[PDB]
């Protein structure tokens, strides 16, 4: 996941007394579309959906339509 | 109940075919057969003085099994390992002037002919001779 979730950049800047080195790492957010982030999620993130409300059955009802 | 070449043992077949070629007496033998070794990785000349007939028989059998082989293919067939002093061994090919003369001598017997694609193959007469030799080998093996 480092390959597609992390963006890295290394640069050099020449100042009066020598060279300084700059390293920047940015971790992209999860985006369902591929616009500003990876489409696929992190491998170990499991999202369990919340169950929907169900009406408790009381009496057998037959509906014809 | 017809015997073919693949049915019999190959070493006995080579021996019998070499004996047949020697007894025929129409094979042409180079003058330098007694002064040469068969490859550059060999140390000595062949022990058997009638080695030319054996090599011709082996070449005919190989052309029977896999036709269209040229001088380079025969050279690769008979190549072997070369030990060179204190250095590691390596694969080495045979002598081209022996393979070429064996093929030419077999063509002189009307047993080998030029292939259309390239190389040499067997004539129907050569195939007939090899099948007859195979039948003789099988009969000798079964009778004893």
């Amino acid at each position: 996941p480092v390959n597609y979730y992390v963006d890295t950049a290394v640069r050099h800047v020449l100042l009066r007394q020598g060279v300084l080195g700059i390293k920047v790492k940015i971790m992209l957010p999860w985006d369902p579309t591929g616009k500003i982030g990876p489409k696929k999620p992190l491998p170990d993130h499991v999202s369990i959906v919340e169950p929907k409300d169900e009406i408790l059955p009381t009496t057998p009802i037959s509906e014809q339509k | 109940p017809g015997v073919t070449v693949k049915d019999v043992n190959q070493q006995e077949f080579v021996r019998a075919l070499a004996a047949f070629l020697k007894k025929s007496g129409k094979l042409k033998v180079p003058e330098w057969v007694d002064t040469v070794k068969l490859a550059k990785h060999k140390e000595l000349a062949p022990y058997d003085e009638n080695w030319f007939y054996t090599r011709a028989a082996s070449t005919a059998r190989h052309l029977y099994l896999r036709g269209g082989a040229g001088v380079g293919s025969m050279t690769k067939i008979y190549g072997g390992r070369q030990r060179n002093g204190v250095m590691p061994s390596h694969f080495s090919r045979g002598s081209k002037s022996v393979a070429r003369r064996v093929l030419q001598a077999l063509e002189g017997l009307k047993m080998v002919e030029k292939d259309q694609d390239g190389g040499r193959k067997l004539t129907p007469q050569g195939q007939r001779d090899l099948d007859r030799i195979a039948g003789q080998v099988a009969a000798a093996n079964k009778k004893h």
């Binding site: 499991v46 999202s47 369990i48 169950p51 | -």
Partner: protein, 81 residues
């Protein structure tokens, strides 16, 4: 070793808490339910979660577990107690 990391255990416990009715003692039916309800981006992780869910369901059937508690189980224990 075959110890399960906390990811699998947490996912299995949450699945059992939320969907106790749909689960059972069968590994294959459990692994079919898990992909229906949960989002696991790996096949091996889904298999591990289902295999722990089956073990936990068997343990629950044997008796109460130190961790998760089912609403139906709590209501039944109220009648027991």
């Amino acid at each position: 070793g075959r110890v399960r990391t906390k990811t699998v255990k947490k996912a299995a416990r949450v699945i059992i808490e939320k969907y106790y009715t749909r689960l059972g003692n069968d590994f294959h039916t459990n692994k079919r339910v898990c992909e229906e309800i949960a989002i696991i981006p790996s096949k091996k992780l889904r298999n591990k979660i289902a295999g722990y869910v089956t073990h936990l369901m068997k343990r629950i059937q044997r008796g109460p577990v130190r961790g998760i508690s089912i609403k139906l189980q709590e209501e039944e224990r109220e009648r027991r107690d």
